[PDB]
């Protein structure tokens, strides 16, 4: 018999993104080639099958630095990290291949699905 | 020119609640009288003006235990913690006074607003 506040989940994500932009309570650095991205482990886990697996590992759960596979493109990762914290995906002709490859590696099934759809249309 | 995934924020919150239920990456215990509640500091901050203030404090940000005011009712807190992680509020005749008082203390303005509305109707 609960009532529900429609905008609650969006408002929570908006505040988590504000914490990220201000580097508040970030507990991990994701290294992608020469580039570094600060984030919250819980948000990464909630969005990605790969980070979910990494941070549930009894040894990796305690690491403050995670290095991604050298094939991963920093821009593709940046676009996906922004999507995790906003629900908004900056999908463009020039980045779609790098975004799909990064989403497949990160195990972000809904992003992979829209990339496959957008590629098929062109 | 971004695209948006409508269910993303809700799916993120659902996964954060799954992490909470399994006690994964919880980093704080909230003590309410004899009762203890494990949670994620970032989720508490995103939902509550009080926790936002506590965990942005340069000293309190590092505490693993937070003790609430002894007037706070553990059931009212439990109902509000559930709302934080689900968007669902278990508001009932028998708990509405304790829920409103706890939401005022936690600075959860939208919960305070619906409690004031539901009380006014009766």
């Amino acid at each position: 018999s609960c009532i529900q506040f429609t905008r609650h989940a969006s408002d929570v994500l908006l505040n988590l993104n504000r914490l990220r932009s201000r580097d508040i309570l970030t507990d991990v650095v994701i290294v992608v080639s020469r580039e570094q991205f600060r984030a919250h482990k819980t948000v990464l886990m909630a969005c990605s099958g790969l980070f979910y697996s990494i941070f549930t590992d009894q040894l990796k759960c305690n690491l403050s630095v995670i290095n991604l596979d050298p094939e991963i493109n920093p821009e593709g990762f940046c676009i996906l990290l922004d999507f995790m914290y906003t629900s908004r995906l900056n999908l463009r002709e020039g980045n779609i291949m790098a975004v799909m490859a990064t989403a497949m590696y990160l195990q972000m099934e809904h992003v992979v699905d829209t990339c496959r759809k957008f590629i098929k249309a062109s | 020119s971004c695209i948006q995934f409508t269910r993303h924020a809700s799916d993120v919150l659902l996964n954060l609640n799954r992490l909470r239920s399994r006690d994964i990456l919880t980093d704080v215990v909230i003590v309410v009288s004899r009762e203890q509640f494990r949670a994620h500091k970032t989720v508490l901050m995103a939902c509550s003006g009080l926790f936002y203030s506590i965990f942005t404090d340069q000293l309190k940000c590092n505490l693993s235990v937070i003790n609430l005011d002894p007037e706070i009712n553990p059931e009212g807190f439990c109902i509000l913690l559930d709302f934080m992680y689900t968007s669902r509020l278990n508001l009932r005749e028998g708990n509405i006074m304790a829920v409103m008082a706890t939401a005022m203390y936690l600075q959860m303005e939208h919960v305070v607003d619906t409690c004031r509305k539901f009380i006014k109707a009766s």
Binding site: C2, I3, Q4, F5, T6 | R88, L89, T114
Partner: peptide
């Protein structure tokens, strides 16, 4: 607020 809604009835979910």
């Amino acid at each position: 607020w809604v009835i979910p």
